[PDB]
Design a binder for this molecule. Sequence first.
Ligand SMILES: C[S@@+](CC[C@H](N)C(=O)[O-])C[C@H]1O[C@@H](n2cnc3c(N)ncnc32)[C@H](O)[C@@H]1O
Ligand SMILES: *C(=O)CCCC[C@@H](S)CC
Ligand code: SF4
Length: 292
Amino acid sequence: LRLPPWLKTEIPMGKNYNKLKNTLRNLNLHTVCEEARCPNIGECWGGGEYATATATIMLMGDTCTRGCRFCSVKTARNPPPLDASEPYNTAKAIAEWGLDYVVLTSVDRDDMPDGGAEHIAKTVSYLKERNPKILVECLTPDFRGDLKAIEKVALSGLDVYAHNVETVPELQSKVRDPRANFDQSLRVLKHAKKVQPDVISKTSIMLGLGENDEQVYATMKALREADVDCLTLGQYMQPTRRHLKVEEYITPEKFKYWEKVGNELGFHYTASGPLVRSSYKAGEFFLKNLVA
Ligand SMILES: C[S@@+](CC[C@H](N)C(=O)[O-])C[C@H]1O[C@@H](n2cnc3c(N)ncnc32)[C@H](O)[C@@H]1O
Ligand SMILES: *C(=O)CCCC[C@@H](S)CC
Ligand code: SF4
């Protein structure tokens, strides 16, 4: 039981924030920020000085078919069916908020035959046909290794394909649902490079789940062997008392250390920090390292 000082946040202020909160409920859309109970809700939904207010619309309802021990998203054996109007409503809300870069994610839908690859592809297609110059990033589930489902999402005009390994291979069984493993997540990023050679790969790992420095170095080196372009490192924070406890709060100095090691291995940009999540300032990192 430890409580750190550098992981403290603020109660969400509602200057430019209720516009996003009321838009998500007008279209009956969900977001991973509210379900996962992220502390960076105020920073991402409301730019302090000059930060475009962005969000992470979570598709296919607020209930996941999997039960990951680090995630607080609701889990049910059979979630409600797909909403056909979700891909169309998402494209309207994103263009309404004036975003030049958007990130989209969804819960795992193991009950769907394609796992929702067609539903995600229609959300990106409706969003790119409406605004061709907008940048889209998809935080895609593993689809249980369905190479056809991964191909359908990667060929939807996607700019950055994102799928997280979450933690080191030695902690896949304790942290993630058994339907997801380390080698499976790498085959999601590898196949996205084969089907779409000009795509940008991106993944996110979490620290504080019992991993050591030796295990983290081998994971990043294996990701570079998978030709993964981008990497994200962040401190795992306990969502609820029912979930996993934090094992070790990584110091901000060591968080900066892995940023240099990522630059050594050749990662196009390594975003590391205690509060750094997968989509945390993802558009700001795109403008600083992925142009030229
Ligand atoms: C809910 S997942 C959605 C992607 C997809 N459903 C999957 O997991 O394969 C979105 C992100 O939230 C993050 N997340 C959930 N709970 C977290 C926590 N307690 N601390 C840090 N990150 C968390 C995970 O890292 C994950 O990458
Ligand atoms: C608490 O740590 C949950 C963090 C959720 C991060 C979402 S908003 C983006 C990956
Ligand atoms: S797959 Fe795991 S991390 Fe993703 S929404 Fe479901 S329980 Fe949460």
